[PDB]
Design a protein around this ligand. Structure first.
Ligand SMILES: [Cl-]
Ligand SMILES: [Cl-]
Ligand SMILES: [Mg+2]
Ligand SMILES: [Mg+2]
Lengths: 278, 277
């Protein structure tokens, strides 16, 4: 991969052109392929989608994720932003190593969140959080291509729905060198517009995780740059899977198969040596 | 002993009256969910597994399928019947080794089909086919628990919609010792009745592959013992995935998320230490 450097630049450029773009979240090679064929320009991994595929609830082994990143890089042929949880450890050096490893696995971007995993103290202290992002940035800037670092503030997922602390963290992460800022759980249009105005740098908003829905155009008008979907695609697939299971158990019928992608089509598409829209 | 109890449970499904559905998961999560939905056994799918891997059907190797069976045995906690394709080679001894390995991976049954993968000679000659099933039967009989061997005739998937030759193959496979007979692609009710009338031993019919649909009741009235879905559950899942992708590309909206399983539900279910209903 001089390919990696090409993807890195293409990915960074998605963030500076006008409008917002969607970064969808496959959880296996198949889905990665299909999203490229659909015309998406980047992919993001989903620790949640990945977990559901393994029959586990959300929250992951670093080595398992590194393998997963490499699988989706190979399959998709697109730039991949990796969900790297909290960097798989508390210490800044751990976060930094995680960034290097994720790049080595082929990612051209990734996210580091400020959730500790400890219910007592579910969000890292501001100082410690910023030091963490600073270490991630230094690792990112030592790479020989532009690595797009997303800094996550997890406040709204852990009962601290405080807009002002959340903005302050994101601003502090931006000032530490983060390229993209993301607060999952903020869904209100007015709250989102205040985030994007205060942050200025690119903001990612996730759709379908909680609350209400906005379109990509609505989000662009609120100043959002990137829109992701976390585990929602995996959960869409699973909702259809469950409806089929239920039909079979309750009725003994298979009409669910009528809306399935025909075998003939998917075998043709996956027989191709690339993911050309087609 | 757990594999022995499953093997007995799976054998018993086939001998009890009426028909049953054997659904086809393609990962650990789909295996757990089917077990939670109250199904009594699971079948792997060469097709569904390939598609998760970004591969067309019949592109997966034996070692990968073996790991996959073991993953699904562990995740589901139910008897597993493995799609073992053509046994991953032409030679009877390769077929026999595939059965032994499948059993080692935790399967209590599996299927060996008569497709060669050679476009211009797509189905094994009769004698060769029977020899292959004989070797599978010998390997199954060497196991310390009853292994339920399904013998597949692939005629209908390779442009030979010849009911008589297909029947005659499944009868030959039965006479060589196969426990279950399966010809994918037959969906006509009269054809299916002709198959179960000629074969007598348990028949598997697949639904959702091609052609028409019938209910489990309708299939059981035609003599069918087992109804599978091959890659159709994977393809269903993928259908929904694709409608979501298309919605996002066309409209830039995310309303597909309304029909998705809530995250709170899937996390609660998978946090469980087992697959209780
Ligand atoms: Cl999710
Ligand atoms: Cl299929
Ligand atoms: Mg996570
Ligand atoms: Mg197959």
């Amino acid at each position: 991969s001089d390919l990696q450097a090409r993807h890195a630049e293409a990915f960074r450029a998605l963030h500076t052109r006008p409008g917002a773009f969607i970064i969808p979240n496959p959880w296996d090679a198949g889905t990665a392929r299909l999203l490229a064929m659909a015309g998406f320009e980047a992919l993001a991994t989903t620790s949640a989608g990945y977990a559901f595929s393994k029959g586990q609830p959300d929250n992951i082994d670093r080595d398992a994720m590194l393998d997963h990143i490499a699988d989706l890089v190979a399959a998709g042929g697109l730039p991949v932003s990796a969900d790297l949880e909290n960097g798989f450890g508390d210490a800044p050096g751990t976060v930094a190593e995680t960034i290097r490893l994720a790049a080595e696995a082929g990612a051209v971007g990734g996210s580091i969140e400020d959730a500790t995993g400890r219910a007592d103290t579910p969000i890292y202290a501001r100082d410690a959080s910023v030091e963490r992002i600073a270490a991630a940035v230094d690792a990112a800037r030592a790479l020989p291509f532009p690595f797009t670092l997303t800094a996550r503030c997890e406040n709204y997922l852990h009962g601290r729905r405080d807009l002002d602390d959340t903005i302050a963290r994101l601003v502090a992460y931006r000032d530490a060198g983060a390229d993209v800022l993301y607060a999952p759980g903020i869904t209100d249009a007015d709250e989102i517009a205040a985030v994007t105005r205060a942050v200025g740098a690119p903001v990612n908003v996730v759709m379908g995780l909680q609350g209400g829905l906005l379109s990509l155009d609505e989000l662009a008008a609120l100043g959002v740059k990137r829109v992701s979907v976390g585990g929602a695609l995996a959960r869409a697939a699973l909702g259809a899977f469950l409806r089929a299971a239920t039909e079979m158990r309750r009725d003994g019928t298979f009409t669910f198969t009528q809306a399935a992608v025909p075998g003939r089509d998917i075998n043709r598409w996956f027989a191709a040596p690339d993911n050309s829209p087609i």
